[PDB]
Amino acid sequence: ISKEYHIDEEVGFALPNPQENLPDFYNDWMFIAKHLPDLIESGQLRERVEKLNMLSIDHLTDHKSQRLARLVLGCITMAYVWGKGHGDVRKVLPRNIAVPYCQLSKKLELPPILVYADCVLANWKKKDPNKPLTYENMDVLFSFRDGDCSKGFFLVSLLVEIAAASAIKVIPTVFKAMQMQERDTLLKALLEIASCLEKALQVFHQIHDHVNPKAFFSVLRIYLSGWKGNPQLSDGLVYEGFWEDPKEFAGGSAGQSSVFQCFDVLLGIQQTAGGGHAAQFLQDMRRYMPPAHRNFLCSLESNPSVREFVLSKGDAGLREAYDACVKALVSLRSYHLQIVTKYILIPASQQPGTDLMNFLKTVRSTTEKSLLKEG
């Protein structure tokens, strides 16, 4: 894989060893971002952001410091917009934060809202660098509220991204085997991908130890929410000093994960084909991924179809191995639907989530229908 796609041998689409501290110049951003639970509870978040001077982004020289700054400002933005998460909202992001956040956003080519790539892919650290990438040796950099289970939700997502990284590095082998007409290597490679996505499902299981349904639904979900098709901000958000009209941007989503999409693309499971809402949504989320990763996806599409290759050969072993990859994705979707019932639907029904359920039902359905032989 070309290093120009920003994919790591070890952590895959995750930003390897993200930067924790910014330059001292940015101490005022860092303070607020580091103390969102405390500032929100004390009712001083909106006051502190308003007392900020407009800082230059020019001292953010490298990619990682720029990415750290995006996480910092995106979390501050979510805290500023949503407040205590009980309906009192702001519809104007002040210039002192809005301007540099948008400057930095345009430069990195992400929209100025917190995305998956901020709060999962850049939002982590090893505790001891020598010790391996395990939950106990890891931690998130930023959270919204005390008891929000943001560490669990984000790190468990990150660990799935990492798990899937072992499959990602096999992708080159697949197209090379196709180009070379090397059937045995193709078979071996597809089995290895299947094996890696199976492992990734076991990593997904860890969620239950680190996230409870009430804390996620009643708190965390709120702070990840966006302002595209949201009654609370019908027309979107005003980035004072940068854009004159309010702009709409979608909130965080698993559809923003590149591993959530790349294996569908690999296997010719045409998730973005046809006019359907799920397809549209999945394509739209490419623009919420970093450009290099967005580029990885559409360049996978430009390569020849693994599916048509496999369909044409009259080779049961190849078909089995292709199906094993597909089956593994079905399993990941099914497990996700279970997680959506426990963490969204049930909590919702108790008060005096369905779109995500149906979205995932469609994604699972499309995945399952791309099997060559039934699972």
Ligand X SMILES: CC[C@@H](NC(=O)c1ccc(Cl)cc1)[C@H]1[C@@H]2C[C@@H](Oc3ccnc4ccccc34)C[C@@H]21
Q: Can you give the length of the chain in residues?
A: 375
Which parts of 111-140 interact with ligand X (CB under 6 A)? 116, 119-120
Binding mask 267-286 for its own copies (x = CB under 8 A): ---x-xxxxx--xx--xx--
Q: Which of 121, 300, 336, 362 binds ligand X (CB under 6 A)?
A: 336
Q: d(Cα 301, Cα 295) in Å, to the nearest integer? A: 10
Q: Assess 240 for contact with its own copies (CB under 8 A).
A: no
Token pair of 285, please?
């989320």
SS3 224: helix
* Residue 20 C-beta: closest distance to ligand X, Å: 20
Q: Which does 257 bind (CB under 5 to 8 A by kind): ligand X, its own copies, none?
A: ligand X
* Residue 163 C-beta: closest distance to its own copies, Å: 26
Q: d(Cα 69, Cα 74) in Å, to the nearest integer? A: 8
Q: d(Cα 174, Cα 182) in Å, to the nearest integer? A: 9
DSSP state of 307: H
According to DSSP, the β-strands at 92-93 and 124-126 are unpaired
Interacting span for ligand X (CB under 6 A) from 43-51, 101-109, 281-289, 326-334: 326-334
Q: Which of 28, 173, 230, 291 binds its own copies (CB under 8 A)?
A: 291
- Has 336 been labeled as part of a binding site? yes
* Residue 362 C-beta: closest distance to its own copies, Å: 11
User: Are the C-beta atoms of residues 6 and 297 closer than 8 Å to each other?
Assistant: no
Binding mask 149-188 for ligand X (x = CB under 6 A): ----x--xx--x---x------------------------
The residue among 260 and 281 lying less far from its own copies, judged by its C-beta, is 281
Q: Which does 329 bind (CB under 5 to 8 A by kind): ligand X, its own copies, none?
A: ligand X
Q: Name residues whose C-beta falls within 8 Å of residue 57's C-beta, 6 or more positions apart in sequence.
A: 66, 69, 100, 103, 104, 107
Q: d(Cα 208, Cα 212) in Å, to the nearest integer? A: 7
- Kindly list the distances between the CA atom of residue 40 and the CA atoms of 54, 82, 85, 247, in Å, as whole numbers in the listed order: 21, 10, 10, 25
Binding mask 92-121 for its own copies (x = CB under 8 A): --------------x--x-x----------
Nearest Cα to Cα of residue 6 among 262, 296, 288: 296
Report chain breaks in the chain, C–N > 2.5 Å, as residues after which they occur.
352
Q: Assess 295 for contact with its own copies (CB under 8 A).
A: yes
SS3 290: coil
DSSP bridge partners of 139: 125
SS3 105: helix
Q: Assess 224 for contact with ligand X (CB under 6 A).
A: yes
Q: Assess 329 for contact with ligand X (CB under 6 A).
A: yes
Interface positions with its own copies (CB under 8 A): 4-5, 106, 109, 111, 228, 236, 247-250, 270, 272-276, 279-280, 283-284, 287, 291, 294-295, 298-299, 301-302, 304
Per the annotation, binding residues for heme b are: 336
Interface positions with ligand X (CB under 6 A): 116, 119-120, 153, 156-157, 160, 164, 207, 224, 252-254, 257, 259-260, 263, 329, 332-333, 336
